[PDB]
Amino acid sequence: RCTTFDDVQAPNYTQHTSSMRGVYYPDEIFRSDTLYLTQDLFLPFYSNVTGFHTINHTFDNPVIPFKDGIYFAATEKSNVVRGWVFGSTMNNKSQSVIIINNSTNVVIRACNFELCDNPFFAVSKPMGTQTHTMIFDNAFNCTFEYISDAFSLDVSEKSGNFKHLREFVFKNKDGFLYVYKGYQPIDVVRDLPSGFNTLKPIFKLPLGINITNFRAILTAFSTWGTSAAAYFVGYLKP
Amino acid sequence: DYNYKLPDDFMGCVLAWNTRNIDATSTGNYNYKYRYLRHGKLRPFERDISNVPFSPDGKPCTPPALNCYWPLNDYGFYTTTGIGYQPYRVVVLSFELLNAPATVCGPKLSTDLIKNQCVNFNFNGLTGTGVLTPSSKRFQPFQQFGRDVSDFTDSVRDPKTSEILDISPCSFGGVSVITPGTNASSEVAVLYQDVNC
Ligand SMILES: *[C@@H]1O[C@H](CO)[C@@H](O)[C@H](O)[C@H]1NC(C)=O
Ligand SMILES: *[C@@H]1O[C@H](CO)[C@@H](O)[C@H](O)[C@H]1NC(C)=O
Ligand SMILES: *[C@@H]1O[C@H](CO)[C@@H](O)[C@H](O)[C@H]1NC(C)=O
Ligand SMILES: *[C@@H]1O[C@H](CO)[C@@H](O)[C@H](O)[C@H]1NC(C)=O
Ligand SMILES: *[C@@H]1O[C@H](CO)[C@@H](O)[C@H](O)[C@H]1NC(C)=O
């Protein structure tokens, strides 16, 4: 169902610096103690990364343009930002892959989804349990189907600095959505922290879909509330 | 090609065959369509299933208004037509040169690996030759070819046993030959192998 909350506060677009991030293994080739040049889509050092800070009033998930490839980060201690849509017009006619984790397993399923303007997970704030999902209702003319390997996830509220930091890279390239992954522990309130971290591939998804826009999917803590958890979006350039 | 684009970079096999008997019905075959108008072009291995009502300017439409066309074509067939208008079922076999753990074999029986120098090793996509030798190289599990300074594959993780081994080539070099005077003596020219003995 297309349930939108009433008070939707606009993002202030607090820019941050992609200090030493967005570096991934460019190919499946082991190289030992060498210097190697690469012409590929990378995140440039010290680029403008649009922050998205979620507070009790601010609910950050705009329809962000994809533009040849994105970097993604998410400062987490409650693992809130679990979910990615990659659509053309974010409506029913266009093709949209939906990469989501429903806290037991990651499910990738591309179809012609009637995208709601406000996807959310009805999770209680003191309890911290996923009750339902209302992301998709109709799925006609479905292309792609995938279910990954299972792993546990914690949902409930914490308070303080961030323990987790999921760092993702999405490249649309000949219809193959290359997805990368890295992780390191941090300690920060709102800034995308400076530091070097290398990302590793997980999915070469044979989609073949027009990806021009995207939107993350948030875990609301239910009249709504969100815990302190920010995410970051950069752009990849050749 | 404006509907299905195959790139110059990545490439596979294109397979077409005639279906005058099956698809080319004598009365018509209007199950198959294709777009003939679209804003811009399509990227390779990328398509648009959606039946968006086309306009040349970019405004949304409702047909049959001025310059509001449907993108799809009434693309019929008849068995009485010529060979140039017959339907052809085309299967495009794109491959992966991106050497992940392999799927297709094209089956040969797989022998046992040996530490012996000079083996014609044929791994998944490496028809090289050389010296299989086990190595202490680390290999994060999403990479399985090792290269050292250049083009040549230095080390491979074995596809059966996941054993990490580096490849040395067949121990080549130049042969040099000492001779004294052939008028002095035709006695044995002693040699060089620029190799471990
Ligand atoms: C975006 O980055 C450019 C340099 O790449 C910089 O000049 C500009 O000030 C940045 N925009 C901000 C910080 O809003
Ligand atoms: C949602 O979770 C179930 C089990 O909890 C599992 O099948 C999968 O991770 C998801 N199923 C979907 C998205 O249909
Ligand atoms: C799905 O797409 C096919 C063509 O690809 C079309 O014939 C069919 O009507 C579509 N389904 C709908 C619009 O429900
Ligand atoms: C994707 O679709 C949008 C509008 O639906 C269009 O502007 C854009 O050119 C398309 N991209 C490609 C690569 O076809
Ligand atoms: C299959 O793989 C396992 C390890 O992944 C290996 O121990 C086993 O020998 C392989 N099977 C055969 C028939 O070699």
Reduced 3-state DSSP string for A157-184 = CCCCCCCEEEEEEEEEECCEEEEEEEEC
Tokens of A198: 């290398």
Please list every residue in chain A whose beta carbon sits closer than 8 Å to the beta carbon of residue B43. 174-175, 210
Between strands A196-206 and B131-134, the pairing is unpaired
**Closest residue to atom 14 of ligand 4, CA basis:** B42
Q: What are phi and psi of A97, to 5 degrees?
A: -85, 145
Tokens of B197: 């003995």
- Nearest Cα residue to A83 out of A96, A101, A70: A101
**Resolution of the PDB structure in angstroms:** 3.2
102-141 in A: which are within 8 Å (CB) of B?
112, 141
> CA-to-CA distance for B79 and B77, rounded, in angstroms?
7
Tell me the residue length of chain B: 197
Question: Any chain B CB within 8 A of the CB of A95?
Answer: yes
C-alpha torsion angle, residues B113, B114, B118, B122 (rounded to 10): 0
> CA-to-CA distance for B147 and B2, rounded, in angstroms?
39
Q: What is the 3-state secondary structure (H, E, C) of chain B?
A: CCCCCCCCCCCCEEEEEECCCCCCCCCCCCCCCCECCCCCCCCCCCCCCCCCCECCCCCCCCCCCCCCECCECCCCCCCCCCHHHCCEEEEEECCCCCCCCCCCCCCCCCCCCCCCCCECCCCCCCCCCEEEEECCCCCCCCCCEEECCCCCEEEEECCCCCCEEEEECCCCCCCCEECCCCCCCCCCCEECCCCCC
β-bridge mates for residue A198, sequence order: A23
- Ligand 2 centre distance from Cα of residue A129 (Å): 14
State which of A107, A130, A152 you would mutate to test the pocket of ligand 2, scoring each by most atoms of that ligand within 8 A of its C-beta: A107
On whether the CB atoms of residues A198 and A184 are closer than 8 A, the answer is no
Q: What are phi and psi of B84, to 5 degrees?
A: -70, -20
> CA-to-CA distance for A89 and A117, rounded, in angstroms?
12
CA-to-CA dists, residue A144 to A99, A112, A114, A208, B23, angstroms: 11, 10, 16, 10, 27
Question: Residue A211 CA: which ligand 4 atom is closest?
Answer: 1
> CA-to-CA distance for A219 and B155, rounded, in angstroms?
45
Work out the minimum CA distance from B156 to partner chain A, whole angstroms. Answer: 9
Closest by Cβ to A175, choosing from B46, B49, B137: B46
Distance of CA B186 to the CA centre of its chain: 57
Q: State the CB neighbour count (10 A cutoff) for residue B28.
A: 11
- Ligand 5 centre distance from Cα of residue B159 (Å): 9
Inter-chain touch A30–B145, beta carbons under 8 Å: yes
> CA-to-CA distance for B77 and B87, rounded, in angstroms?
7
Amino acid at B33: K
Ligand nearest to the CA of residue A93, numbered in listed order:
3
Inter-chain touch A28–B99, beta carbons under 8 Å: yes
Q: Which residues contact B140 (CB under 8 A, 6 or more apart)?
A: A25, A30, A200
Q: Which residues contact B33 (CB under 8 A, 6 or more apart)?
A: B72, B73, B74, B75
Inter-chain touch B98–A30, beta carbons under 8 Å: no
Q: State the CB neighbour count (10 A cutoff) for residue B7.
A: 11
Question: Any chain B CB within 8 A of the CB of A26?
Answer: no
Please list every residue in chain A whose beta carbon sits closer than 8 Å to the beta carbon of residue B70. none
Tokens of B192: 């060089």
The parent domain of residue B165 ranges over 98-172
State which of B31, B33, B47, B51 you would mutate to test the pocket of ligand 3, scoring each by most atoms of that ligand within 8 A of its C-beta: B51
Name the method of structure determination. Answer: cryo-EM
Please list every residue in chain B whose beta carbon sits closer than 8 Å to the beta carbon of residue A209. 46
Between strands B145-147 and B153-157, the pairing is antiparallel
Q: Is A141 buried (19+), middle (13-18) or exposed (0-12) by CB count in 10 A?
A: exposed
- Ligand 3 centre distance from Cα of residue B25 (Å): 22
Which own/partner contact pairs does B170-174 have at CB distance under 8 Å and 24+ positions apart? B170/B117, B170/B118, B170/B129, B170/B130, B170/B131, B171/B117, B171/B118, B171/B131, B171/B195, B171/B196
Closest by Cβ to A28, choosing from B48, B49, B143: B143
CA-to-CA dists, residue A161 to A12, A123, A230, angstroms: 22, 22, 11
Amino acid at A1: R
> CA-to-CA distance for B44 and A169, rounded, in angstroms?
21
Q: State the CB neighbour count (10 A cutoff) for residue A40.
A: 13
> CA-to-CA distance for A65 and A211, rounded, in angstroms?
9
> CA-to-CA distance for B94 and B13, rounded, in angstroms?
6
- Nearest Cα residue to B192 out of B174, B179, B168: B174
- Ligand 1 centre distance from Cα of residue A43 (Å): 15
> CA-to-CA distance for A98 and A106, rounded, in angstroms?
10
- Nearest Cα residue to A78 out of A234, A231, A229: A229
CA-to-CA dists, residue A236 to A70, A99, A172, B24, B45, angstroms: 5, 20, 11, 48, 21
Inter-chain touch A93–B52, beta carbons under 8 Å: yes
On whether the CB atoms of residues A85 and A64 are closer than 8 A, the answer is no
On whether the CB atoms of residues B62 and B68 are closer than 8 A, the answer is yes
Tell me the residue length of chain A: 238
> CA-to-CA distance for B130 and B123, rounded, in angstroms?
12
